Design a protein around this ligand. Sequence first.
Ligand SMILES: *[C@@H](CS(C)(=O)=O)[C@H](Cc1ccc(CN)cc1)NC(=O)[C@@H](NC(=O)[C@H](CC(C)C)NC(=O)[C@@H](Cc1ccccc1)N=[N+]=[N-])[C@@H](C)O
Ligand SMILES: *[C@@H](CS(C)(=O)=O)[C@H](Cc1ccc(CN)cc1)NC(=O)[C@@H](NC(=O)[C@H](CC(C)C)NC(=O)[C@@H](Cc1ccccc1)N=[N+]=[N-])[C@@H](C)O
Ligand SMILES: [Mg+2]
Ligand SMILES: [Mg+2]
Ligand SMILES: [Mg+2]
Ligand SMILES: [Mg+2]
Lengths: 195, 195, 224, 212, 196, 196, 204, 222, 219
Amino acid sequence: MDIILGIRVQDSVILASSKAVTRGISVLKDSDDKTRQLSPHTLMSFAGEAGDTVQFAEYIQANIQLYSIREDYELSPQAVSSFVRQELAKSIRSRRPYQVNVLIGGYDKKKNKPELYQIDYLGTKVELPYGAHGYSGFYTFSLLDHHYRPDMTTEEGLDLLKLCVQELEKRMPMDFKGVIVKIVDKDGIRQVDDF
Amino acid sequence: MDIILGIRVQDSVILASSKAVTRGISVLKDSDDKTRQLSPHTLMSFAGEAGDTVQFAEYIQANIQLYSIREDYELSPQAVSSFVRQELAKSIRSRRPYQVNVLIGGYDKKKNKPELYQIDYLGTKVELPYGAHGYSGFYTFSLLDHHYRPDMTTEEGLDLLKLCVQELEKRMPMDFKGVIVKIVDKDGIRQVDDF
Amino acid sequence: TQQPIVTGTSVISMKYDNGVIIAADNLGSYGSLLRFNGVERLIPVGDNTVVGISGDISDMQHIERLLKDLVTENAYDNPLADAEEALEPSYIFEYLATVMYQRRSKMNPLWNAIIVAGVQSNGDQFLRYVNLLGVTYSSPTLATGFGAHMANPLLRKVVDRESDIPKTTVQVAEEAIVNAMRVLYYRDARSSRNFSLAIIDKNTGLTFKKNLQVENMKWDFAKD
Amino acid sequence: TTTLAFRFQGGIIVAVDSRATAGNWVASQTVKKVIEINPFLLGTMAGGAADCQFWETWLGSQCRLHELREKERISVAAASKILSNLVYQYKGAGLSMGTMICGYTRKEGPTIYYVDSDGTRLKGDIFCVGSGQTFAYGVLDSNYKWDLSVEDALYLGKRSILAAAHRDAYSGGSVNLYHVTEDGWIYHGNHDVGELFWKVKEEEGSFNNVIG
Amino acid sequence: TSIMAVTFKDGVILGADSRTTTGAYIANRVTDKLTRVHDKIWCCRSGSAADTQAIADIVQYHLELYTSQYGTPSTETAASVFKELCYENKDNLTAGIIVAGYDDKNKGEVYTIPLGGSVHKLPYAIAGSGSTFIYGYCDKNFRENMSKEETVDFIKHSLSQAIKWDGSSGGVIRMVVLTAAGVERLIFYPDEYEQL
Amino acid sequence: TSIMAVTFKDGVILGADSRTTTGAYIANRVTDKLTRVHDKIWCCRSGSAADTQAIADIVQYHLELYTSQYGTPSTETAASVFKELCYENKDNLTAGIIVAGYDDKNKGEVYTIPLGGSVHKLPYAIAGSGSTFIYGYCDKNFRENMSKEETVDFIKHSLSQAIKWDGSSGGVIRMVVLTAAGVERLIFYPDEYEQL
Amino acid sequence: SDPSSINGGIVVAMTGKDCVAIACDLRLGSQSLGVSNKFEKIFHYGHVFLGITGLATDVTTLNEMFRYKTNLYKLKEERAIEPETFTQLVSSSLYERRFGPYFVGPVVAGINSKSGKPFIAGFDLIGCIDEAKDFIVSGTASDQLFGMCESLYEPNLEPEDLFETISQALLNAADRDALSGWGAVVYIIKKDEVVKRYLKMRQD
Amino acid sequence: QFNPYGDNGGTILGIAGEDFAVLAGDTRNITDYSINSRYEPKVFDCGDNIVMSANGFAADGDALVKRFKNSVKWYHFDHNDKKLSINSAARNIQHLLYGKRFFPYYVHTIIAGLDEDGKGAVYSFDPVGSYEREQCRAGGAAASLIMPFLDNQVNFKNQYEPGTNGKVKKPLKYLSVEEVIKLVRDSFTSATERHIQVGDGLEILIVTKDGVRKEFYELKRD
Amino acid sequence: TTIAGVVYKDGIVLGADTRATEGMVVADKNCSKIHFISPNIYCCGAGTAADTDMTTQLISSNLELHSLSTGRLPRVVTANRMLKQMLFRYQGYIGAALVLGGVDVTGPHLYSIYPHGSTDKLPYVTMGSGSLAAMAVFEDKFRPDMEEEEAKNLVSEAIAAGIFNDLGSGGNIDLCVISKNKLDFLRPYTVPNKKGTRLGRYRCEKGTTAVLTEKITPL
Ligand SMILES: *[C@@H](CS(C)(=O)=O)[C@H](Cc1ccc(CN)cc1)NC(=O)[C@@H](NC(=O)[C@H](CC(C)C)NC(=O)[C@@H](Cc1ccccc1)N=[N+]=[N-])[C@@H](C)O
Ligand SMILES: *[C@@H](CS(C)(=O)=O)[C@H](Cc1ccc(CN)cc1)NC(=O)[C@@H](NC(=O)[C@H](CC(C)C)NC(=O)[C@@H](Cc1ccccc1)N=[N+]=[N-])[C@@H](C)O
Ligand SMILES: [Mg+2]
Ligand SMILES: [Mg+2]
Ligand SMILES: [Mg+2]
Ligand SMILES: [Mg+2]
């Protein structure tokens, strides 16, 4: 899978993730949602090797949903990210490692803060104001360096994200068929259906 | 360079050729004309390895223009294609071969017939009603098999070509930034500026 | 996976009217070095079977022990060990064939080509080949490695098909084998003059001949 | 190989070619690339012949055990995931498998899942898999709409395989058609390309690249 | 291959086996590896047969042309021509050549030219694959100024052992005697030398 | 390495050089390659020093435990234990071992175990890199039922030549005499054997 | 990668009673992709016919080269080249590129105008002549053609008997090869008439 | 490096009649340019009116045939001496072959017999057990020489009725056992003439309701 | 391929099979492998067939020009040298493996020439994939100074060994007998295998094949 972006604004985290699924010469699908809801206020986007991506995402989802039922409690985004990192850090020295990179965008209901974690397939975790995986960052980080402010609104975050996607549509060779955008805030997770 | 198409209708030859020039991770240009006018009624589109493509096209252009001046006469499309094939067939056993594929679309003023020649970097020449190089053909030939008729008008040829480009835009992974279209008929060569 | 180190060359054999003949030279080569000049590569099992082995000598010695051990094991709780329930050539072969294919299938082969020659209970001639890959085949003449290329052509002129076996006497068959061994000594760089030959006949039993030599050698045309 | 399956107003159409190759050697032109898992489930086969035939037969056994155990027809979503989770276990061992799991159930309506040997499992309305997918995609994508009748949908599927049968060297032989509806699947014949091609050419007035 | 050249009182003797192998197949069992480049200058050949034959033919040509102009060449001169070819074309050749010859002034002389293209003048020389097995024997048993019969026996016993142990060597033992008296060819068959 | 074991009238003698090289560097010039596995069963070691030392220690253990239970093992039994280790671990070992021992019943016996793990009982055996150079010499000069002084001289001359020609061999010639009389260790320095 | 099986296609030639026949498929591809169904592989220089299978650029190059050479031959000799002579010319021309060969499988067919004798021949890519009376086969379905020809063929066939033999040999061989077919052409050649027939075959 | 596979040559041919089936194979066994045996049987009676051949690497072929024969024996023990039907045999063989998916039996397997309606049946397997019921199938070295001929002569491919000129196909009339044996022998004669690995002898096993019969014919020995 | 030669009392007997293969397929069952060098010298050919053909033709052509200039028959040594020096120059890339036999002013001579440029001068030789089968027959039965019909039988017997036992070899047996008084080119000497007889007629009847269009042009 190709482009996955994330941006943490004042009161929310926004994840943008490409719709294209391409095997070889053919674009098999142009409406693929590269994300799973781990808990009501925590969303994980993912990209990497075919099969591994979804298998890993669904496996993490299942474990967080199990924790949620057992304790009747939602884990903090920090806790979910640390769980996910450990799973990847375990994976890298396996017989066959998961080749999956992720962004975990969550709203911590205790601290009343949005949080964005970027974790690669090696288990390299970082908390960021904005993040990307693969080649996306090479184009987008310079934009976000320029335009980002920590006190931005969700609408300003979406405008800044449009500017990122336009730059990717201009300068990247692969047609990634646009992005599905999702907002993670105090009220939960919702999908921006027009982008 | 990526997609180059050609279609010979009743009274003209239409060449469609992608605008993208991509080196590595970045799309360097989105308005590149992958064609040279060899003579007033003969156009050659081209695609292949960087540098070699233009160098070859311009070298062929120079030789045909020299012939035109020397004899005060335009070579037939058949003759120009046979010259080009021989140059490529000579090339393939060189120290460093030209990695260039071409389509030669021409109007034979003697026979009053449009003619389309497809020649690959090995010097493999074929006259066709419609042709393509690289992966383009895999998608487009089945459309053209279905819809083509030899007695089509130039406008019908352009509509059939739009259907080819739409299918390429849907199913190909690379963003080729649209196509420049050129018509070769009895009156010469002209560019369709809106496509 | 290994590589063969100390090696034995051609084992040759044929059927005749009443039984089978088998032969093999007494050399253990160490690459181009003709290292060991006293190696027996025909190993009898009972009085009705001779197993001739080519290829890796350490692996041959292992197979030799497996056969020695097979005789011991067959004798256990077997009052007819020297009679109706003695080991048959076909039993000894099938065992070896099972082992050879099992070992190739674990990617750890016994690096040999084997010919089991003998006579069965009912007087039938037994002659069958097996190698490191578990490949098996029978023919009126059989030969391993080099002998397949030079011995078989000569031996097939005596017995070309099944119907020639009853017409072939033990004298004709033994002459052919000894003649083939001479030809191999002229032309195989990893062979020796000294060899062993074994006749297994349905009437006269097992005759094992040691310390034979290639003789009647034409060198006189060299001087010119 | 060319296999396709698409969703429309009146169900699912599934069409496949019938050729098996060992390199350039046409080994057979009377091959079954569709498995009938039950009256409501179909599987298409591309990639390795054995790997498909075997694991899709096995899938059918696992689908049976589900409906015995649970007294209910297995969902297409569940059937497809038995196969996707299986192949994922063998990932990196060199299985070659490009498949489509097509069926109907009251719960999900008509449904198609693409499953392949490197783990990918995708729901969708149109899929083409095989060495001739691109040729099929071309014709199919450009004549498709939900609107389509069952007569036109069956033909488009037939025609899109013919398209690929012609251009792709490794596709051809015959076209096996299937229609899947709420009441189950219905076989719609084996159409030899030998005769179909010349008929389609004459009647449709297409394939003008050809001498005939 | 097992080859040697040995100086003695009256001159020099060259000796060789007769086996040429393609892998384990004996292509030629009666090979003549002692080849004449001049009346009383011969060479023992080891290595690539094509290479040593090509070289020996070129040397014969050079010494024929030398003789036309400057009279009989010395054994040293012959060795120098062999060397020049072997050294300057070392990258494309596989040739181990012993050169042996009889002058009246210098008497018997032996020059060995191993793979590198170096020259080494010696009282005797051994070479070829079978030579490894007889370094011990030859060093212990060689004496200078042996008689003809002693030198024939020294070569016969030596190559007998080389043949016994080396599979690449075999067949007849050929020899070429080079003295004032002339050129004598000797041959010794397996039945004679194997029982030594 | 140059090693050998030779049977004679009164028993058997083992012989070896003392050089151990790391490439062209002589790591140890006074190596003891004749190692004891039982009172009158010894072995000559060639190949990987680590492997042959590891094997010899394991054999010594097996024969010590054999002796505890079943009394003195035969030389054949010792050779079989060496073989079993070398053959079953052929893929991970580089060991060429000669086994030599004195029974009163069987007298002197020599078993050679080359790289493959095969066993070969012989009147005498030679092994190691330097052995190639003395096949010819040893075959010509060995007789059965030699005296102690003849067998010491046969081994001394043989290894002297092996040392002379093999760079991997050198230093002192150690020997170990195995007879009814007991176990005698002999050493012979360069100044003695080089002048032979 | 293998130059002889990028583009694909086949040629077969047969002898009959006072006649020869040569036939070819019409396919040109880039491996799996079919490109042209009008790529003929049989050419003629006077009354001598030459089929060429293999790498299509070399097929074209060699055709152009033998046209060149046979034209000069005719100008100098003042007569058309004969099959026996042309066969030797092809062999020479192929072998002069011994260490950088044309990746082709040529087939000569024709009737000697003086003797009247029917003649066919085949070559490897470096010019060794297969000089067989019965039949010559070439291309990606050569094995298939060998099998068809060996069982269908018999000597001294009349022109229209021979047509049915060569046509069925080509068609059924081509249908067992992925890289052959897409149409076919059969030339029936007699001492002073040549009949060229295009065959109806499956287009997959 | 050790290569566990080899090629023993050989060529086999299965043809399904209306109420019979034949499975033929040459009797030559080879490695490289050498003949190992001029008569080494390759097509086997496995019981229950099923004949089988596993052509290719003879060791893997022998191993598979042996295992299937044993599968027939244990099918009798475990299911009250029930006859193993040809379709059931085929599925059982798929599992035998696929069981070694990642270290295959390097063979092209063909079985022949009668289906449960009494009609002739041939099944054809790849090395990893993909299989299908077929009317006609040649396998091994000279399969490319034989199959086109069988398409033409058995199934009447590219044949049309004289006078109609391509409009009416030659009808698919049924072949007798004598007719099929002629095609088998001539297929092997042609294959023998043109393929170096084919020769020595041809052995044909014929399956009818009355049982399994054998016929043997000489083939050219060079 | 099985090619062989022997030196007999009066001269040289050369022998060859007739199978030309392309991999496992037999392209020609009766091809000629005994080539003409000069009127008194012939050459059996194995290895790469084109190389074998063209190497013999070139040296034959050059010997013809040599022989026209000198006015005397060419020798086997000069044929041997010219082949040898050429093959050596090309370092084995010309895959010609020849048995060269002829009769000179100096008597009969037989050579084996290898692709790399080595030559052996011998009383008997064999080459090709069937050399071991043929050489077995020579080691079994060869003796020096054989009579003509005996030598013919031995070579024929040696080629036969190759034909039957080697898969690369087959078809008929060609001989070439060369002496001072004659040259006998025997093609075929023997036909050891009959062509397999076909039991059915599978030739189609007229009008069976489907034609699209036809064109007739006269000459
Ligand atoms: C087309 C798929 S494509 C060209 O890759 O897009 C078909 C699909 C298909 C689906 C189902 C079935 C059911 N029987 C058949 C075909 N696939 C193929 O044609 C594949 N071919 C094979 O798997 C063939 C099948 C035989 C019967 C011709 N076998 C082989 O390729 C190898 C297998 C092999 C295994 C182990 C060792 C050696 C070889 N065989 N042989 N012989 C596609 C891969 O071509
Ligand atoms: C037997 C030689 S062998 C393998 O040593 O037994 C014959 C000898 C021979 C000599 C002369 C003639 C006719 N003049 C025929 C045969 N050699 C061969 O049969 C060789 N076969 C070929 O060379 C064939 C010839 C065609 C015409 C059948 N060509 C090929 O096999 C290759 C050519 C090629 C050769 C070398 C490098 C690249 C290509 N094919 N094509 N196409 C022997 C090589 O099989
Ligand atoms: Mg096609
Ligand atoms: Mg020897
Ligand atoms: Mg086809
Ligand atoms: Mg044959």
